[PDB]
Design a protein around this ligand. Structure first.
Ligand SMILES: [Cu+2]
Ligand SMILES: [Cu+2]
Ligand SMILES: [Cu+2]
Ligand SMILES: [Cu+2]
Ligand SMILES: [Cu+2]
Ligand SMILES: [Cu+2]
Ligand SMILES: [Cu+2]
Ligand SMILES: [Cu+2]
Ligand SMILES: [Cu+2]
Ligand SMILES: [Cu+2]
Ligand SMILES: [Cu+2]
Ligand SMILES: [Cu+2]
Ligand SMILES: [Cu+2]
Ligand SMILES: [Cu+2]
Ligand SMILES: [Cu+2]
Ligand SMILES: [Cu+2]
Ligand SMILES: [Cu+2]
Ligand SMILES: [Cu+2]
Ligand SMILES: [Cu+2]
Ligand SMILES: [Cu+2]
Ligand SMILES: [Cu+2]
Lengths: 295, 295, 295
């Protein structure tokens, strides 16, 4: 796209503020930003806020979201679809033109770990170029295992294809399949979907801890066979809904856009890989590490 | 197949009648019928009754089915396998020769949303050419959410490949992935698996309604990441068995031949896409629309 | 690999013995063994004990496993990862060099049907070449349906690719997809992953029996849409954990490495195919047979 040549828009922080007991404002950009998805491989990603996946959004069950998209793409329209919300797609997930903003309002009345993404046709194009992320809606009543959890992180799986190539996006195998982590609390890592960062800078935990991961597989196209090496999931809540409660799972099948809360105990010091067990994907990047130490 | 050149057998209505409180007669054809699966693309489908997927069958839990297949294919044998039933495959899902009929009897003692398909070797060939459909077995005791449901429809996902090409069917990506709808009540649409009809003539609903969809992904080969845009599934029953009850799902993972009952509320007027969230498939046809109006 | 030319190491029995009420010794080899995966097609598999998948391991919930790997590969390191166990991957699933042994100890405190596999980088290589299998951990309290089960078997699904070809393993469709059976009791068949043996020598059962299958899809790469023709699963326990209890499933979605216990009734004499309902895979080998007789 001639108007994206040489474009590399610096990442912009997510803006969020609570405006009432049940109402939140969120402001995101659509922007075009170079991301290093594998060593020496730059992808001029279509993004929210210069991250791909986009920035983590966390709201409470029952919060109405008043969402603004500021479209910094000089020539492509963009839009936002939160899977968390009840909305009219044809009124509320509509396009925002280059250099314009739009504001849309809709309720998040279901707990869980939801994909969000650009909803502009062709949606496959906008997602595959980078316009995906997660919104967590925290359950009013928690999870029944909350008191057991020592530490928590967010991990998101996505694929990367040949650049902006619709034939590849539709018909081709992924070039890379990757994990990223998005921060929940100060100090947590906040990374993009790449083949290396979570190997070189593993997530951290302590021996004996029960870990919760909020996970989503945003695709665009593949399903995920999510597994942590050296443990078993003690508890799993499909889509992060507390009702959908499995136990003792070695691996969690996630559809494209599928989420989960998963919990597991790390009993011994060491480095624990986190994989999709579809090992062709793992080979192509989708292995993160969790380093577990006595401190 | 030289004997299928120029063949285009007109669709024949499904014949069904109840013959006792727990016994139903069904009569289907196997026939070769031209179907427009994408604009300007005709597939000379191997079909039940000139529809692909085939006609909807609905029975009650506990019904014994006395099924007749009238094989109108001039040269290929065909057969019928209902996933709903307990049967001996080697006695009851056997071939019916060209220009012959066969009758097979077997019980449907499990509720749910079951694939049916031709069972003739190579089964991949017979399914991929079009010989798939759904049989719904209604639970004796309903679903616990029955009283909440305002409107219901059936949707079926399938793929289309290069015509009658076994190499493609085994090794190739689908050319098209599609939804169709099959009528439950008078006035409901009854369509074939194509890339357009459910976009151009959306399913209809009213603002505020709880919608039930009976869904099945008949494949032949892909899994489905089933999602309705702008809502969340309030309730999901895997395979349509009331016991397999999930809540609050954004997306439902369906294996090949996998079914579900899914229920969701449409809160605002607008057009709501229905997708497989494996967006390469959606791009290749698998997007239906639900138009929600104040009336 | 020049050091594997002409190598065909005879299969070696699994060695296992109980050493205390809650402790078991297991001794396995890593070895290079020719296996006929389709008629006339030999794969010089990387294996545990000269079987691919490897030998069945069965332990009780709560058993600590003291595992020895004797590496007979003349030049490639190998290792063992049991999904059943809590272990430090970087200490306990480490490599054993050619012509050496290693012993690792770790607890199996979760019931179910777990994949095991070599964990040596690149893991995709070691799994795809043949180094996968199942470990069953029997639940302390059984399954609630135990008293209904008449007969049980183990079935494992895997893929085969072009020989030792990492490009194919990562980017290519499987050449073959196959079932094998591993013995639970004397007289049960014990087979390797091939396209024919379970068609030519079907598993055996009696009319009216409730059958339990312990199943796992070891991949490396595909998901499985597991179905038995002519029946419906009465009960399914995901990953073989008794808590994860579905009913009335026509087909069970297994991720890569995903397991299940599934139970179904065979009501009539006949031959019952067992498939993955992803019919491209079935075409490429993944159909086993269950022959049901009056005796
Ligand atoms: Cu309040
Ligand atoms: Cu506001
Ligand atoms: Cu966009
Ligand atoms: Cu793929
Ligand atoms: Cu703790
Ligand atoms: Cu593993
Ligand atoms: Cu664990
Ligand atoms: Cu009666
Ligand atoms: Cu009759
Ligand atoms: Cu047929
Ligand atoms: Cu595909
Ligand atoms: Cu209503
Ligand atoms: Cu979506
Ligand atoms: Cu909803
Ligand atoms: Cu004891
Ligand atoms: Cu010992
Ligand atoms: Cu190995
Ligand atoms: Cu494949
Ligand atoms: Cu019995
Ligand atoms: Cu079938
Ligand atoms: Cu059954």
């Amino acid at each position: 796209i001639a108007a994206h040549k040489g474009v590399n828009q610096a990442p912009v922080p997510l803006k969020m503020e609570r405006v009432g007991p049940h109402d939140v404002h969120i402001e995101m950009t659509a922007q075009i930003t170079d991301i290093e998805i594998d060593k020496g491989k730059i992808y001029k990603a279509w993004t929210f806020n210069g991250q791909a996946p986009g920035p983590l959004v966390v709201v409470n069950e029952g919060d109405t979201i008043h969402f603004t998209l500021k479209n910094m793409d000089p020539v492509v329209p963009h839009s936002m679809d939160f899977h968390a919300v009840h909305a009219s797609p044809s009124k509320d997930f509509i396009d925002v033109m280059p250099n314009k903003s739009g504001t849309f309002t809709y309720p998040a009345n279901k707990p869980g770990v939801f994909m969000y993404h650009c909803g502009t046709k062709p949606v496959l194009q906008h997602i595959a170029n980078g316009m995906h992320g997660v919104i967590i809606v925290k359950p009013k009543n928690g999870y029944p295992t909350d008191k057991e959890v020592d530490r928590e992180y967010v991990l998101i799986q996505n694929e990367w294809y040949k650049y902006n190539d619709m034939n590849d996006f539709q018909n081709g195998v992924p070039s890379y399949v990757v994990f990223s982590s998005k921060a929940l609390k100060p100090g947590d890592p906040n990374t993009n979907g790449d083949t290396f960062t979570l190997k070189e800078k593993p997530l951290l935990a302590k021996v004996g801890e029960k870990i919760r991961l909020y996970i989503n597989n945003v695709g665009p196209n593949e399903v995920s066979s999510f597994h942590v090496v050296g443990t078993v999931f003690d508890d799993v809540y499909l889509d992060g809904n507390p009702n959908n409660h499995l136990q003792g799972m070695q691996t969690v099948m996630l559809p494209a856009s599928g989420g989960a809360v998963v919990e597991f105990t790390v009993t011994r010091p060491g480095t624990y890989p986190i994989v999709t067990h579809q090992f062709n994907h793992a080979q192509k990047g989708a292995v993160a590490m969790l380093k577990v130490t006595e401190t």
